[PDB]
Amino acid sequence: ASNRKFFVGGNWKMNGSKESNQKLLKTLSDAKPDANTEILVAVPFVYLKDVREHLDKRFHVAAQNCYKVASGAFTGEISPAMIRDCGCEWVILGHSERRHIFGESDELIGEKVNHALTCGLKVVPCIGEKLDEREAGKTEQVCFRQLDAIKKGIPKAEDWSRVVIAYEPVWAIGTGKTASPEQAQEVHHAVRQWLEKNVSQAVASSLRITYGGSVTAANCKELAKKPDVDGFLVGGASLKPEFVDICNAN
Amino acid sequence: ASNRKFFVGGNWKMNGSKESNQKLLKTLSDAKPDANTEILVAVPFVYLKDVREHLDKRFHVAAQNCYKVASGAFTGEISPAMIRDCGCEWVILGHSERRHIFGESDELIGEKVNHALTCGLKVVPCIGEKLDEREAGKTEQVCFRQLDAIKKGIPKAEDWSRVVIAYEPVWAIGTGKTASPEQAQEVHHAVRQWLEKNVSQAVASSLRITYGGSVTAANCKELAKKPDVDGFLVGGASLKPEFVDICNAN
């Protein structure tokens, strides 16, 4: 056994309204507390303050992105300073959609990580390969490059305690084609040893590597059983009552 | 001799905090700038609902950006549906920072305009040239390409009544390098002639084409005197109390 506490994230992505959210959050507060699972929701900026004040401090409330300075001439960007000013402590960075769709460079994710961590936030950097990269056998090549650019952004060694990595194969996002427990175990295993070789045994030992990619109430329990899977980043199912089931996957 | 109402918008960019927001809005709330001016304020997403909630219906409140679909798997994006949900009806689109730092194409700005107008919002699409395209003599070619891709996203001619153009030369943004009154008038005039030929005479004569880029209380009146400059998009000076004086420039 390791010292890794199970971590469940719910990424709402671009979904939500006053009326939709208030019902969702009630469901969430309705479930009994579980001191054994770290639970995060990542909500749209326009709701970020409002969600935070409608959920007990037990649950982490995250922004879905941020930028890399506190203030400045960046029309339409949000800083860690503004996230904290909204009562919040978490941010998701380098989600596949920001990298592939909005084109954000491995380098830019690096700088955002650096800045977020220097401002005392906790981060969830995402990695993973596209379908075309998996058909071409570049899964390992992709994850390694992405992870190298993440460590390059880490202010100090100790700040790894405020990082949770999520591996999300892009072919598994939205597609209903969840990685098998063996497929995910294979990548998570390779991530943890890469952290051993490229970072530090102590960092590899304590880091929660979470799986993302069509996580449902029907598949979460088999994935959570695997020894290198420390949790999930849930997309679609984060908006439904079953999210509660998925929080109870371990 | 025109029918066009004076328009002054304040783009706060990536600046704001609940504390400094209350201070700004008080200066603006307590004062009484000309009822002959449309006053717009474009705020960070995290504080959008609160600013609309605490600012008179005298004022417009805008998002600084949005995406081109109503809901979806676009981590980090805010839709027109969520902006309306927050009580707000305006969006800045194609700001220079959004085109040149964050990689938004002309085709993307066009499609965002399409989706925002379809959803009922009013839009402030932004066009202008960098210090190098001006030094290359391509101001016109650049602004025209920008204009054509905005026209392509107008779902029908009637929608231009919910459009205000902002011309902001990138070489004037946050530098103190204000366009001269004659440099603004010349570009605005040519933009209006482009409109006149490619859309309507009805659309050209009614459209506010506004200037931004180092607008301050000290230079606004000479720019506002020019007949095809119909107001402003103010950045830096929108955070200062002199924003009220720029609201009174006509």
Author numbering:
A (entry chain A), B (entry chain D): 2 to 251
Passage from the reporting paper:
To elucidate the molecular basis of FhTIM inhibition, we obtained the crystal structure of FhTIM at 1.9 Å resolution. The asymmetric unit displays three FhTIM dimers. Each protomer shows a typical (β/α)8 TIM-barrel fold. The catalytic pocket of each protomer in the FhTIM structure is occupied by a sulfate molecule (SO42−), likely from the crystallization buffer. The β/α loop 6 (residues 168–180 of FhTIM) is known to open and close when accommodating the substrate in triosephosphate isomerases. Interestingly, the SO42− ion is located in the same position as the phosphate group of the substrates (glyceraldehyde 3 P) in the P. falciparum (Pf TIM) or S. aureus TIM structures (PDB ID: 1LYX15 and 3UWU24, respectively) through similar interactions. Indeed, the three unbound oxygen atoms of the O4 tetrahedron in the triose phosphate moiety of Pf TIM interact with the main chain nitrogen of residues G175, S211, G236 and G237, as do 3 out of 4 oxygen atoms of the FhTIM SO42−. The remaining oxygen of the SO42− present in the FhTIM structure (and spatially corresponding to the oxygen atom linking the phosphate to the sugar in the natural substrate) is coordinated by a water molecule roughly located at the position of the distal carbon of the substrate analog in Pf TIM.
One enzyme, triosephosphate isomerase (TIM; EC 5.3.1.1), is of particular interest as an anthelmintic target. TIM catalyzes the isomerization of glyceraldehyde-3-phosphate and dihydroxyacetone phosphate in the fifth step of the glycolytic pathway. Structurally, most of the known TIMs are homodimers, each monomer consisting of eight parallel β-strands surrounded by eight α-helices that, together, form a typical “TIM barrel” fold.
